[PDB]
Amino acid sequence: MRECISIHVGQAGVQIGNACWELYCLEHGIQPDGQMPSDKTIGGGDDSFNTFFSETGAGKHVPRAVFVDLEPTVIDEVRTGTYRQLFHPEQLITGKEDAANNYARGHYTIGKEIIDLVLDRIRKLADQCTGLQGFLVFHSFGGGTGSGFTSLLMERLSVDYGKKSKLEFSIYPAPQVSTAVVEPYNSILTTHTTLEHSDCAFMVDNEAIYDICRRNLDIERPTYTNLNRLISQIVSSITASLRFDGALNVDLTEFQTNLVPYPRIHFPLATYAPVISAEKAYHEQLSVAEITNACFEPANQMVKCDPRHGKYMACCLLYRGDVVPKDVNAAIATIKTKRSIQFVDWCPTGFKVGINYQPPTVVPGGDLAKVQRAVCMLSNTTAIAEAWARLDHKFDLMYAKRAFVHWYVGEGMEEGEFSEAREDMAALEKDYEEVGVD
């Protein structure tokens, strides 16, 4: 058994982190007070769920997580929320004034003053691990903390934990749930300084979660709560292999091996199905072929793009529920003859498949309907570069006028870092084009 430490940075990371640990507890049968009746080894054990939960002598199962925000209002909901008993106070870290949606403010001004404290707390969790695998870092692209302080933490994690893997869960900015005009700046600044430090990053475009919530869940105007419960479902699908018995993606090193042959192109596209509304009269349960075919519909993708016009470098099918390998291969054969799946020549044209019999758990009183079987497809497509292109375009519009740049320079950042970060994105876009275009 090897431990994974989760780090939640900023409002998006903290609220999403909260929705994930709520789901993990219902999945592993952990009560809010931390007790777990099914765990017969009291105060210890090396079970699969122990990669995410430590145990006290009193039988409390404590998440291996740290919550960091530069302002305290979001983490206070955790301190007084339903699962206030799970985390001890040292795990929840808050400052007094945030980064004001200003990457430079969260990275330089405020980051410099709180970085050594965050590391000390992470060190406390690491000292509980007999074999730490790495870190899972949740954060937003647009926030000043999510962008600015995360990239600083990622730099220091590579220094203090050189041989440890690092996976990101990054929230891509979407205007329908964002009030920050400068998020394109923050997104590119943090991608530039984080690129060489992240081994595998799962981008979630808020625009996609928003539309899934309106189209499939009949939510007229979704909230962060509706978004996070759906995002945590996908996150659970992606991290289940680390928390349950199995042989696919059993350690963080395996995520890179099975999803990232090229180190810089480490942004797999996530596709999830099915999302059924709980308020529905009653749904006809979809088969393995129907949910698997849905993984190739852009409307269930975490980032809106067209994989028909890219090239695949890897593909993982993660099933949860009543699924047997026979039905998977039968659905895949049907899809290869009907879909446009173009692989790169220097990679095999195959699918790694993972099946966990336990169907997806749904938070009581939530929006998602209980389904008998679901799938999350992780494919590394060049088509996800469309998201970088959109982002880069908005960046160029504002930077050509130097709009808002004074706020960043006023916090000690040099204007050159803007173009240095932009030229890196231009290179990242060139690599995608050299890999998936003829």
Partner: protein, 54 residues
């Protein structure tokens, strides 16, 4: 359409289908960035105070 490395346990199974074969900054350097930006903020503020003192 071949199946390889099939694993079965009580809680699920995993396998691989192959359709077709193929054809950092140090601790010191980080401190210099942070302190460089801090020095630029102190200089900008000193100019503001020199202006206000005038």
């Amino acid at each position: 359409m071949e199946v390889i490395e099939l694993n079965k346990c009580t809680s699920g199974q995993s396998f691989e289908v192959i359709l077709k074969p193929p054809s950092d900054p140090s601790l010191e350097e980080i401190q210099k960035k942070l302190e460089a930006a801090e020095e630029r903020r102190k200089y900008q503020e000193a100019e503001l105070l020199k202006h206000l003192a005038e």
